[PDB]
mmCIF file of all heavy atoms in Angstrom:
data_model
loop_
_atom_site.group_PDB
_atom_site.id
_atom_site.type_symbol
_atom_site.label_atom_id
_atom_site.label_comp_id
_atom_site.label_asym_id
_atom_site.label_seq_id
_atom_site.Cartn_x
_atom_site.Cartn_y
_atom_site.Cartn_z
ATOM 1 N N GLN A 8 0.861 -1.178 -0.002
ATOM 2 C CA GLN A 8 0.007 0.001 -0.001
ATOM 3 C C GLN A 8 0.900 1.230 -0.001
ATOM 4 O O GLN A 8 0.677 2.177 -0.758
ATOM 5 C CB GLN A 8 -0.915 -0.002 1.228
ATOM 6 C CG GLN A 8 -1.974 1.090 1.223
ATOM 7 C CD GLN A 8 -2.926 0.989 0.038
ATOM 8 O OE1 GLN A 8 -3.298 -0.110 -0.383
ATOM 9 N NE2 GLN A 8 -3.342 2.133 -0.494
ATOM 10 N N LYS A 9 1.939 1.200 0.826
ATOM 11 C CA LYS A 9 2.911 2.287 0.929
ATOM 12 C C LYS A 9 3.718 2.400 -0.355
ATOM 13 O O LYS A 9 3.912 3.492 -0.887
ATOM 14 C CB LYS A 9 3.858 2.046 2.106
ATOM 15 C CG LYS A 9 3.188 2.005 3.459
ATOM 16 C CD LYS A 9 4.205 1.737 4.554
ATOM 17 C CE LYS A 9 3.521 1.551 5.894
ATOM 18 N NZ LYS A 9 4.505 1.198 6.960
ATOM 19 N N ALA A 10 4.176 1.256 -0.852
ATOM 20 C CA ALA A 10 4.994 1.187 -2.055
ATOM 21 C C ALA A 10 4.315 1.524 -3.375
ATOM 22 O O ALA A 10 4.837 2.346 -4.149
ATOM 23 C CB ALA A 10 5.646 -0.192 -2.171
ATOM 24 N N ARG A 11 3.167 0.934 -3.660
ATOM 25 C CA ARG A 11 2.468 1.181 -4.933
ATOM 26 C C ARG A 11 1.015 1.625 -4.825
ATOM 27 O O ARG A 11 0.356 1.811 -5.857
ATOM 28 C CB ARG A 11 2.574 -0.046 -5.850
ATOM 29 C CG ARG A 11 3.996 -0.457 -6.164
ATOM 30 C CD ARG A 11 4.054 -1.435 -7.352
ATOM 31 N NE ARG A 11 3.440 -2.730 -7.068
ATOM 32 C CZ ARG A 11 3.424 -3.748 -7.912
ATOM 33 N NH1 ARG A 11 4.023 -3.643 -9.108
ATOM 34 N NH2 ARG A 11 2.838 -4.903 -7.593
ATOM 35 N N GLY A 12 0.519 1.798 -3.611
ATOM 36 C CA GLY A 12 -0.852 2.219 -3.421
ATOM 37 C C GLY A 12 -1.890 1.138 -3.671
ATOM 38 O O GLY A 12 -3.011 1.417 -4.083
ATOM 39 N N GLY A 13 -1.498 -0.116 -3.433
ATOM 40 C CA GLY A 13 -2.414 -1.232 -3.626
ATOM 41 C C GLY A 13 -1.673 -2.548 -3.854
ATOM 42 O O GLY A 13 -0.446 -2.586 -3.855
ATOM 43 N N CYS A 14 -2.442 -3.613 -4.049
ATOM 44 C CA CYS A 14 -1.882 -4.937 -4.275
ATOM 45 C C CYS A 14 -2.927 -5.861 -4.879
ATOM 46 O O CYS A 14 -3.995 -6.072 -4.289
ATOM 47 C CB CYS A 14 -1.364 -5.541 -2.963
ATOM 48 S SG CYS A 14 -0.828 -7.287 -3.094
ATOM 49 N N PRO A 15 -2.660 -6.407 -6.072
ATOM 50 C CA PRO A 15 -3.605 -7.325 -6.730
ATOM 51 C C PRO A 15 -3.679 -8.633 -5.925
ATOM 52 O O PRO A 15 -2.677 -9.320 -5.751
ATOM 53 C CB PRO A 15 -2.983 -7.517 -8.112
ATOM 54 C CG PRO A 15 -1.508 -7.352 -7.863
ATOM 55 C CD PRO A 15 -1.449 -6.200 -6.888
ATOM 56 N N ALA A 16 -4.868 -8.920 -5.410
ATOM 57 C CA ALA A 16 -5.052 -10.129 -4.615
ATOM 58 C C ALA A 16 -6.396 -10.785 -4.926
ATOM 59 O O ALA A 16 -7.423 -10.131 -5.050
ATOM 60 C CB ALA A 16 -4.954 -9.814 -3.127
ATOM 61 N N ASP A 17 -6.341 -12.110 -5.042
ATOM 62 C CA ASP A 17 -7.499 -12.940 -5.358
ATOM 63 C C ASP A 17 -7.922 -13.616 -4.044
ATOM 64 O O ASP A 17 -7.357 -14.618 -3.637
ATOM 65 C CB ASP A 17 -7.063 -13.985 -6.394
ATOM 66 C CG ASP A 17 -8.237 -14.753 -6.987
ATOM 67 O OD1 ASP A 17 -9.178 -15.095 -6.250
ATOM 68 O OD2 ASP A 17 -8.180 -15.035 -8.213
ATOM 69 N N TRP A 18 -8.951 -13.043 -3.408
ATOM 70 C CA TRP A 18 -9.488 -13.522 -2.125
ATOM 71 C C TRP A 18 -9.738 -15.033 -2.046
ATOM 72 O O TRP A 18 -9.338 -15.677 -1.076
ATOM 73 C CB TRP A 18 -10.781 -12.763 -1.790
ATOM 74 C CG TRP A 18 -11.258 -12.876 -0.363
ATOM 75 C CD1 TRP A 18 -11.011 -11.992 0.650
ATOM 76 C CD2 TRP A 18 -12.095 -13.905 0.201
ATOM 77 N NE1 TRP A 18 -11.652 -12.407 1.801
ATOM 78 C CE2 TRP A 18 -12.315 -13.571 1.546
ATOM 79 C CE3 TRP A 18 -12.660 -15.077 -0.327
ATOM 80 C CZ2 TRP A 18 -13.096 -14.371 2.388
ATOM 81 C CZ3 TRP A 18 -13.444 -15.865 0.522
ATOM 82 C CH2 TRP A 18 -13.645 -15.511 1.862
ATOM 83 N N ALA A 19 -10.400 -15.580 -3.054
ATOM 84 C CA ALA A 19 -10.713 -17.017 -3.072
ATOM 85 C C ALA A 19 -9.473 -17.913 -2.946
ATOM 86 O O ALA A 19 -9.546 -18.987 -2.359
ATOM 87 C CB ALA A 19 -11.513 -17.363 -4.328
ATOM 88 N N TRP A 20 -8.355 -17.450 -3.497
ATOM 89 C CA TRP A 20 -7.115 -18.212 -3.456
ATOM 90 C C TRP A 20 -6.253 -17.893 -2.235
ATOM 91 O O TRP A 20 -5.524 -18.761 -1.740
ATOM 92 C CB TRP A 20 -6.311 -18.003 -4.735
ATOM 93 C CG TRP A 20 -6.883 -18.730 -5.898
ATOM 94 C CD1 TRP A 20 -8.085 -18.500 -6.530
ATOM 95 C CD2 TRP A 20 -6.290 -19.837 -6.596
ATOM 96 N NE1 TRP A 20 -8.259 -19.387 -7.559
ATOM 97 C CE2 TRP A 20 -7.178 -20.223 -7.624
ATOM 98 C CE3 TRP A 20 -5.090 -20.532 -6.443
ATOM 99 C CZ2 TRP A 20 -6.910 -21.278 -8.503
ATOM 100 C CZ3 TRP A 20 -4.815 -21.590 -7.318
ATOM 101 C CH2 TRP A 20 -5.721 -21.945 -8.321
ATOM 102 N N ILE A 21 -6.321 -16.653 -1.745
ATOM 103 C CA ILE A 21 -5.533 -16.216 -0.595
ATOM 104 C C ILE A 21 -6.025 -16.824 0.713
ATOM 105 O O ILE A 21 -5.219 -17.173 1.584
ATOM 106 C CB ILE A 21 -5.532 -14.673 -0.488
ATOM 107 C CG1 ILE A 21 -4.819 -14.077 -1.703
ATOM 108 C CG2 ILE A 21 -4.870 -14.226 0.817
ATOM 109 C CD1 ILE A 21 -3.341 -14.472 -1.806
ATOM 110 N N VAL A 22 -7.336 -16.924 0.862
ATOM 111 C CA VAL A 22 -7.930 -17.516 2.059
ATOM 112 C C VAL A 22 -7.685 -19.024 1.975
ATOM 113 O O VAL A 22 -7.970 -19.640 0.951
ATOM 114 C CB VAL A 22 -9.438 -17.234 2.106
ATOM 115 C CG1 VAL A 22 -10.072 -17.954 3.291
ATOM 116 C CG2 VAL A 22 -9.682 -15.720 2.204
ATOM 117 N N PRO A 23 -7.124 -19.635 3.030
ATOM 118 C CA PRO A 23 -6.828 -21.088 3.067
ATOM 119 C C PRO A 23 -8.075 -21.991 2.988
ATOM 120 O O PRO A 23 -9.159 -21.610 3.435
ATOM 121 C CB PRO A 23 -6.076 -21.242 4.389
ATOM 122 C CG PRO A 23 -6.638 -20.141 5.246
ATOM 123 C CD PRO A 23 -6.674 -18.990 4.275
ATOM 124 N N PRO A 24 -7.907 -23.215 2.439
ATOM 125 C CA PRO A 24 -8.955 -24.239 2.278
ATOM 126 C C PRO A 24 -9.619 -24.760 3.568
ATOM 127 O O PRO A 24 -10.614 -25.493 3.506
ATOM 128 C CB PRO A 24 -8.247 -25.344 1.498
ATOM 129 C CG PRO A 24 -6.832 -25.216 1.933
ATOM 130 C CD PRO A 24 -6.620 -23.720 1.944
ATOM 131 N N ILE A 25 -9.041 -24.403 4.711
ATOM 132 C CA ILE A 25 -9.601 -24.764 6.015
ATOM 133 C C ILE A 25 -9.432 -23.577 6.965
ATOM 134 O O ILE A 25 -8.520 -22.766 6.770
ATOM 135 C CB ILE A 25 -8.910 -25.980 6.700
ATOM 136 C CG1 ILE A 25 -7.396 -25.766 6.790
ATOM 137 C CG2 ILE A 25 -9.277 -27.286 6.022
ATOM 138 C CD1 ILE A 25 -6.751 -26.602 7.870
ATOM 139 N N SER A 26 -10.318 -23.481 7.943
ATOM 140 C CA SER A 26 -10.262 -22.423 8.953
ATOM 141 C C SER A 26 -10.112 -21.022 8.353
ATOM 142 O O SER A 26 -9.401 -20.173 8.901
ATOM 143 C CB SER A 26 -9.089 -22.699 9.894
ATOM 144 O OG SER A 26 -9.238 -23.984 10.476
ATOM 145 N N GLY A 27 -10.824 -20.769 7.252
ATOM 146 C CA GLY A 27 -10.750 -19.480 6.590
ATOM 147 C C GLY A 27 -10.923 -18.259 7.477
ATOM 148 O O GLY A 27 -10.028 -17.412 7.546
ATOM 149 N N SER A 28 -12.045 -18.184 8.197
ATOM 150 C CA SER A 28 -12.346 -17.034 9.053
ATOM 151 C C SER A 28 -11.474 -16.887 10.273
ATOM 152 O O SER A 28 -11.533 -15.868 10.982
ATOM 153 C CB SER A 28 -13.818 -17.018 9.456
ATOM 154 O OG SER A 28 -14.138 -18.061 10.344
ATOM 155 N N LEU A 29 -10.625 -17.893 10.531
ATOM 156 C CA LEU A 29 -9.721 -17.861 11.658
ATOM 157 C C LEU A 29 -8.438 -17.132 11.274
ATOM 158 O O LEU A 29 -7.610 -16.847 12.145
ATOM 159 C CB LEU A 29 -9.399 -19.290 12.129
ATOM 160 C CG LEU A 29 -10.613 -20.182 12.427
ATOM 161 C CD1 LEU A 29 -10.126 -21.510 12.981
ATOM 162 C CD2 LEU A 29 -11.549 -19.495 13.413
ATOM 163 N N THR A 30 -8.266 -16.866 9.995
ATOM 164 C CA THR A 30 -7.083 -16.145 9.499
ATOM 165 C C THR A 30 -7.470 -14.692 9.185
ATOM 166 O O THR A 30 -8.604 -14.420 8.782
ATOM 167 C CB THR A 30 -6.461 -16.822 8.243
ATOM 168 O OG1 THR A 30 -7.335 -16.665 7.118
ATOM 169 C CG2 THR A 30 -6.220 -18.314 8.507
ATOM 170 N N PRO A 31 -6.530 -13.760 9.332
ATOM 171 C CA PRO A 31 -6.771 -12.336 9.059
ATOM 172 C C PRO A 31 -7.231 -11.957 7.650
ATOM 173 O O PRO A 31 -8.038 -11.051 7.484
ATOM 174 C CB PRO A 31 -5.457 -11.670 9.441
ATOM 175 C CG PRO A 31 -4.437 -12.754 9.195
ATOM 176 C CD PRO A 31 -5.140 -13.961 9.762
ATOM 177 N N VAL A 32 -6.711 -12.674 6.634
ATOM 178 C CA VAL A 32 -7.062 -12.379 5.241
ATOM 179 C C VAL A 32 -8.552 -12.514 4.939
ATOM 180 O O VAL A 32 -9.092 -11.814 4.062
ATOM 181 C CB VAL A 32 -6.215 -13.215 4.257
ATOM 182 C CG1 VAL A 32 -4.741 -12.878 4.405
ATOM 183 C CG2 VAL A 32 -6.451 -14.703 4.483
ATOM 184 N N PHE A 33 -9.234 -13.416 5.647
ATOM 185 C CA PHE A 33 -10.653 -13.650 5.428
ATOM 186 C C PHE A 33 -11.485 -12.371 5.637
ATOM 187 O O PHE A 33 -12.416 -12.101 4.891
ATOM 188 C CB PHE A 33 -11.152 -14.738 6.380
ATOM 189 C CG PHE A 33 -12.621 -15.051 6.229
ATOM 190 C CD1 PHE A 33 -13.054 -16.101 5.423
ATOM 191 C CD2 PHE A 33 -13.584 -14.307 6.926
ATOM 192 C CE1 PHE A 33 -14.405 -16.404 5.295
ATOM 193 C CE2 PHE A 33 -14.934 -14.605 6.799
ATOM 194 C CZ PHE A 33 -15.351 -15.646 5.991
ATOM 195 N N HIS A 34 -11.083 -11.583 6.632
ATOM 196 C CA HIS A 34 -11.794 -10.348 6.952
ATOM 197 C C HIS A 34 -11.271 -9.124 6.180
ATOM 198 O O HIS A 34 -11.703 -8.007 6.419
ATOM 199 C CB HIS A 34 -11.734 -10.108 8.451
ATOM 200 C CG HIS A 34 -12.083 -11.316 9.270
ATOM 201 N ND1 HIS A 34 -13.384 -11.712 9.481
ATOM 202 C CD2 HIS A 34 -11.305 -12.256 9.855
ATOM 203 C CE1 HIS A 34 -13.387 -12.850 10.168
ATOM 204 N NE2 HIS A 34 -12.137 -13.197 10.399
ATOM 205 N N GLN A 35 -10.395 -9.381 5.218
ATOM 206 C CA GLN A 35 -9.806 -8.302 4.428
ATOM 207 C C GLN A 35 -10.345 -8.266 2.995
ATOM 208 O O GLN A 35 -10.187 -9.226 2.245
ATOM 209 C CB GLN A 35 -8.278 -8.475 4.397
ATOM 210 C CG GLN A 35 -7.532 -7.492 3.495
ATOM 211 C CD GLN A 35 -7.679 -6.062 3.953
ATOM 212 O OE1 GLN A 35 -8.214 -5.211 3.231
ATOM 213 N NE2 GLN A 35 -7.186 -5.786 5.156
ATOM 214 N N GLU A 36 -11.002 -7.166 2.611
ATOM 215 C CA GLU A 36 -11.517 -7.043 1.243
ATOM 216 C C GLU A 36 -10.287 -6.931 0.319
ATOM 217 O O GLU A 36 -9.234 -6.443 0.745
ATOM 218 C CB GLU A 36 -12.427 -5.823 1.080
ATOM 219 C CG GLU A 36 -13.715 -5.920 1.896
ATOM 220 C CD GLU A 36 -14.624 -4.702 1.771
ATOM 221 O OE1 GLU A 36 -14.113 -3.609 1.438
ATOM 222 O OE2 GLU A 36 -15.847 -4.851 1.984
ATOM 223 N N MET A 37 -10.415 -7.430 -0.898
ATOM 224 C CA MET A 37 -9.310 -7.396 -1.845
ATOM 225 C C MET A 37 -9.761 -6.989 -3.232
ATOM 226 O O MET A 37 -10.941 -7.101 -3.579
ATOM 227 C CB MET A 37 -8.619 -8.765 -1.894
ATOM 228 C CG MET A 37 -7.898 -9.154 -0.605
ATOM 229 S SD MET A 37 -7.362 -10.885 -0.592
ATOM 230 C CE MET A 37 -7.190 -11.174 1.148
ATOM 231 N N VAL A 38 -8.816 -6.503 -4.022
ATOM 232 C CA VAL A 38 -9.059 -6.076 -5.393
ATOM 233 C C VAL A 38 -8.178 -6.926 -6.295
ATOM 234 O O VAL A 38 -6.964 -6.977 -6.122
ATOM 235 C CB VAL A 38 -8.696 -4.587 -5.573
ATOM 236 C CG1 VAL A 38 -9.123 -4.103 -6.952
ATOM 237 C CG2 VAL A 38 -9.354 -3.746 -4.479
ATOM 238 N N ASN A 39 -8.798 -7.595 -7.266
ATOM 239 C CA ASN A 39 -8.070 -8.463 -8.171
ATOM 240 C C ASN A 39 -7.928 -7.841 -9.560
ATOM 241 O O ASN A 39 -8.912 -7.439 -10.177
ATOM 242 C CB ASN A 39 -8.774 -9.827 -8.260
ATOM 243 C CG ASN A 39 -7.921 -10.895 -8.913
ATOM 244 O OD1 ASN A 39 -8.448 -11.927 -9.384
ATOM 245 N ND2 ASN A 39 -6.614 -10.691 -8.950
ATOM 246 N N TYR A 40 -6.681 -7.734 -10.029
ATOM 247 C CA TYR A 40 -6.390 -7.177 -11.342
ATOM 248 C C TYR A 40 -5.072 -7.706 -11.882
ATOM 249 O O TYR A 40 -4.241 -8.228 -11.131
ATOM 250 C CB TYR A 40 -6.401 -5.634 -11.306
ATOM 251 C CG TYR A 40 -5.611 -5.014 -10.175
ATOM 252 C CD1 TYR A 40 -4.302 -4.546 -10.392
ATOM 253 C CD2 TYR A 40 -6.168 -4.881 -8.904
ATOM 254 C CE1 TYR A 40 -3.578 -3.964 -9.338
ATOM 255 C CE2 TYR A 40 -5.445 -4.301 -7.859
ATOM 256 C CZ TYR A 40 -4.148 -3.846 -8.087
ATOM 257 O OH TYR A 40 -3.440 -3.277 -7.051
ATOM 258 N N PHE A 41 -4.877 -7.558 -13.189
ATOM 259 C CA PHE A 41 -3.671 -8.037 -13.870
ATOM 260 C C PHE A 41 -2.619 -6.981 -14.156
ATOM 261 O O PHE A 41 -2.865 -5.998 -14.861
ATOM 262 C CB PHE A 41 -4.062 -8.747 -15.173
ATOM 263 C CG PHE A 41 -2.884 -9.111 -16.043
ATOM 264 C CD1 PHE A 41 -2.285 -10.365 -15.929
ATOM 265 C CD2 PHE A 41 -2.373 -8.224 -16.994
ATOM 266 C CE1 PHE A 41 -1.206 -10.722 -16.742
ATOM 267 C CE2 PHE A 41 -1.300 -8.556 -17.812
ATOM 268 C CZ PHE A 41 -0.717 -9.808 -17.689
ATOM 269 N N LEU A 42 -1.417 -7.216 -13.616
ATOM 270 C CA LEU A 42 -0.266 -6.358 -13.841
ATOM 271 C C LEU A 42 0.798 -7.211 -14.511
ATOM 272 O O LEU A 42 0.829 -8.440 -14.350
ATOM 273 C CB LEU A 42 0.317 -5.827 -12.543
ATOM 274 C CG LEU A 42 -0.534 -4.864 -11.700
ATOM 275 C CD1 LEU A 42 0.259 -4.426 -10.484
ATOM 276 C CD2 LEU A 42 -0.944 -3.663 -12.548
ATOM 277 N N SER A 43 1.675 -6.557 -15.263
ATOM 278 C CA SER A 43 2.778 -7.225 -15.962
ATOM 279 C C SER A 43 4.058 -6.527 -15.476
ATOM 280 O O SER A 43 4.036 -5.306 -15.258
ATOM 281 C CB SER A 43 2.610 -7.053 -17.473
ATOM 282 O OG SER A 43 3.628 -7.726 -18.170
ATOM 283 N N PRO A 44 5.175 -7.269 -15.318
ATOM 284 C CA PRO A 44 5.418 -8.702 -15.528
ATOM 285 C C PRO A 44 4.459 -9.628 -14.808
ATOM 286 O O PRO A 44 3.964 -9.312 -13.716
ATOM 287 C CB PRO A 44 6.840 -8.880 -14.996
ATOM 288 C CG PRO A 44 7.484 -7.581 -15.360
ATOM 289 C CD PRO A 44 6.429 -6.586 -14.926
#
């Protein structure tokens, strides 16, 4: 956020396959987009 003002993140993949809501990322909204490289 400090470095580039954001971060492309895919919530469905970032949240683990078990105990999702027990991890901090579950409660974090995310924005998914494509950057290159």
Side-chain angles (χ1 to χ4, degrees):
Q8 188 61 37
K9 298 179 186 177
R11 301 195 294 184
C14 173
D17 190 321
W18 195 96
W20 286 67
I21 295 298
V22 175
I25 53 158
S26 304
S28 70
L29 307 185
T30 69
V32 297
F33 180 95
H34 312 281
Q35 175 64 242
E36 295 179 336
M37 293 169 202
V38 187
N39 193 199
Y40 48 97
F41 172 92
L42 294 182
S43 182

